[PDB]
Design a protein around this ligand. Sequence first.
Ligand SMILES: CCCCCCCC/C=C/CCCCCCCC(=O)OC[C@H](CO)OC(=O)CCCCCCCCCCCCCCC
Ligand SMILES: CC(C)CCC[C@@H](C)[C@H]1CC[C@H]2[C@@H]3CC=C4C[C@@H](OC(=O)CCC(=O)O)CC[C@]4(C)[C@H]3CC[C@]12C
Ligand SMILES: [Zn+2]
Lengths: 625, 65, 62, 46, 59, 64
Amino acid sequence: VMALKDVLNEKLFLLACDKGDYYMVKKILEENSSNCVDRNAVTITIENENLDILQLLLDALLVAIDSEVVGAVDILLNHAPVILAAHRNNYEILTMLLKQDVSLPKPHCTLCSAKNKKDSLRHSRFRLDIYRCLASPALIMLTEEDPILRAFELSADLKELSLVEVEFRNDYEELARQCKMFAKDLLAQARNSRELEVILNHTSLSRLKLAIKYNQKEFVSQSNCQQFLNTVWFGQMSGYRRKPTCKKIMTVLTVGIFWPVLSLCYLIAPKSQFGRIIHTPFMKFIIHGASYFTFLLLLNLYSLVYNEDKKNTMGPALERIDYLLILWIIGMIWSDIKRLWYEGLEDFLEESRNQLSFVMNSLYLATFALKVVAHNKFHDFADRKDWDAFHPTLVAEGLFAFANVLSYLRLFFMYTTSSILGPLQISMGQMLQDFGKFLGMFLLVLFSFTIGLTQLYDKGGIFCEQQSNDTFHSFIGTCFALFWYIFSLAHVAIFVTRFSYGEELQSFVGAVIVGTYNVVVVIVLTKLLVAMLHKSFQLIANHEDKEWKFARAKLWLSYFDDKCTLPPPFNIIPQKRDENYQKVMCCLVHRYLTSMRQKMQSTDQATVENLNELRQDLSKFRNEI
Amino acid sequence: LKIVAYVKYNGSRPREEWEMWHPTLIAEALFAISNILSSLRLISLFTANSHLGPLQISLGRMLLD
Amino acid sequence: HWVVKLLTCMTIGFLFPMLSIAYLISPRSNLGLFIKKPFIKFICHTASYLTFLFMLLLASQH
Amino acid sequence: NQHYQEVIRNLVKRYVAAMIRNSKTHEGLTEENFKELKQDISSFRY
Amino acid sequence: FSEFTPDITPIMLAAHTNNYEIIKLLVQKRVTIPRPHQIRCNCVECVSSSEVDSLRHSR
Amino acid sequence: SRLNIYKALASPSLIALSSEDPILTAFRLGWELKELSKVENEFKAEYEELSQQCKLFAKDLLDQ
Ligand SMILES: CCCCCCCC/C=C/CCCCCCCC(=O)OC[C@H](CO)OC(=O)CCCCCCCCCCCCCCC
Ligand SMILES: CC(C)CCC[C@@H](C)[C@H]1CC[C@H]2[C@@H]3CC=C4C[C@@H](OC(=O)CCC(=O)O)CC[C@]4(C)[C@H]3CC[C@]12C
Ligand SMILES: [Zn+2]
């Protein structure tokens, strides 16, 4: 058994101040005329909103703000605190407290390093306390001139701090999310298109481009922002949306088919009726799309018009079709430097479509550089079967075929425009990150079994009709054989594991090693991969609409600039507004305050409760007098 | 097994004539299996990585079923 | 950036034998104290195991 | 041991304070205490 | 600062609130609600309103 | 009766009030309650809940 153990006027004064006692506290003050802890004997009265009793005692501050009692704070102020007030995120006390001049030190030196040596837990906590005060929606509205821009910059600031402060990761990304949701709610108060155009065109579509740079996905997906995008995207052809589905397709096909004419008309008469057609973004996207579709058609026709007598030619000359492809490739390349030069390396390299253009453009230059050199060096007439394995003509055709795969794979970005295949394509893009983690673990398993298998057989391939044991006689051959076992489609037979001359025991051991590899990879690693794709997809499915809309708006904005207007073959050929912004800002800010109050003040319990409090004050006064 | 095989035999013989339970063959098979097992020990170092380590722990937790 | 971390890790791993002999000869020396850091010690152990595996690769090539 | 006890004395003090306020997400009983104040005023009366 | 959009009428707000008693009170006065055009209407007024101010038209 | 006694012993207030060091007591009590669920098969849920309560109390005490 274990025995549990805990390891007069002041009491009359404390009990009196607890429960609505004013006159006989005045009596206790009279008795004392002739700091107790259960506390200054005043904090209890502060939390009870007994201002009359409080005023009598006055004739703590941080506790009053923690209780959000405006009356107590006002009396205490009449008879850092700002940082704690901003934590509570409310307007009345924040306005009153800031009326007196108040400063707040900015966060990061050599001096700060000295403090971190003495106490690092305290140093980290203070920095997070300041940033939580700065990210208060009430404080930004009352202190900042451009609340929308302030929320954009702070949100990007707080996201970076989460990466460095790994242990404070959760707290910081909660503050960044709060900043993003504030700027989106400010935009939702716009009422007409005049206010919408003022907000989204201000410069410190600069605001619209700034949101894309700062990854404001919630801001972009708002209905006001989406409606504004549609008008600019379609431009003067707003009647396109009124046309039926059968009439829409005939308009797109007609514009695409006559793309060479429209691109030529803008070249000679830019100001004509047909010249200005390209200027609207939607038709520019179609013209650029139809230009690329003809480039892929030329590649398909390259083999069809290939003369059979050139298959045995070692130094074939460039055909007319070859000159056409050279013109397109220079056109595609020329547009690439322009985009990179106007934006920068990091912005340009970030998009996957741009990366696929880098590799395929170098491969197209290599095959044509090799083709010209081969025609000038090796022109002999000999059959194909007698050439060297690494002849320049054979190397040129290997690079050309590889670049054709990357040309057709660039069409993935065109699925983003569609509202049916758009969300699905974005969902598949985000699940590719989970595949990379499985590659690291599987790559070590494949390397482990390759070591043992080549040790057992080399002392004593799969691409022949009769597969033999010779696939295990090299490191490269062993890796290829194990690679084709992953599918479970019986690409490689078991007879391969058997030694050619005998080695009865060593043949059985090699078969057991391969059988263990199959169970580990095909039955264990594959099922584990499916388990996470089931888990990750459910989380992704939640934000499917918000992610797709951000990707579509990013793609549309690239066609708003007039820097690149001509298609690739044709491209190679040679205080007044700040005052208006402030007027809209004050309207949006004041609407937000009014709207937000109804969001949380709906039950009205503190109205009837306040009436009951007045009733109790009157009742206590009655008997007391 | 290598020492036993070295002590027992002094002459040379073609491989195709040896019995299946010759000590040398068992030694080579055990060496190959030991190589395979030794290469797999690197999985225990995945715990130090923020990306690979959670996947390694989750895989270990699901092996009971 | 992670490339600098990778370069530092590879540089420390390549020098593990010298650090081991330095610790063996004189722990009082600064080089001997250098290996006592847990992170450098982990890097040295990983480098030694990787060297063992690489030399296992050589035997398989015969 | 003396230093460990001092830190434990303060950690327990903040813990009992913390979860009471975290339990105030459900504390709307202030009005019922207000009635206790009316009862105390009646007791002072008689 | 006006809390409601200028196109809001008392009957429209009452219908938005879905209060049976207030709607019964107002409808006794014989109020009316403007009728909407077709989803694909292409007339002078619709086009003029959409080009002049599309957000207000949609709202 | 055993279940009632062990629920009484695993209250954070009692440990905070009548233990020399609540952290070590919480550790030992949580481990002991965890071992008990494997013996009392019928009442395993309650014992796991009590052990989780002890662990949460220890973590929350550390959090201050
Ligand atoms: C990254 C790490 C992931 C987890 C790794 C461990 C996973 C758990 C399993 C380990 C695999 C153990 C080895 C199993 C295969 C042995 C080789 C083998 O049989 O080769 C044939 C060899 C050669 O013909 O034959 C034998 O070994 C003779 C005995 C065969 C008896 C039949 C099979 C026994 C049951 C095996 C079940 C495997 C799972 C099937 C699920 C549908
Ligand atoms: C398939 C063939 C090429 C062999 C593959 C070997 C890998 C399975 C092993 C070998 C060395 C290992 C690495 C050795 C040391 C580290 C550093 C370790 O982090 C640290 O200690 C430093 C801090 C950091 O960089 O995060 C994280 C795991 C990692 C990358 C290991 C990850 C798994 C690696 C790459
Ligand atoms: Zn109409």
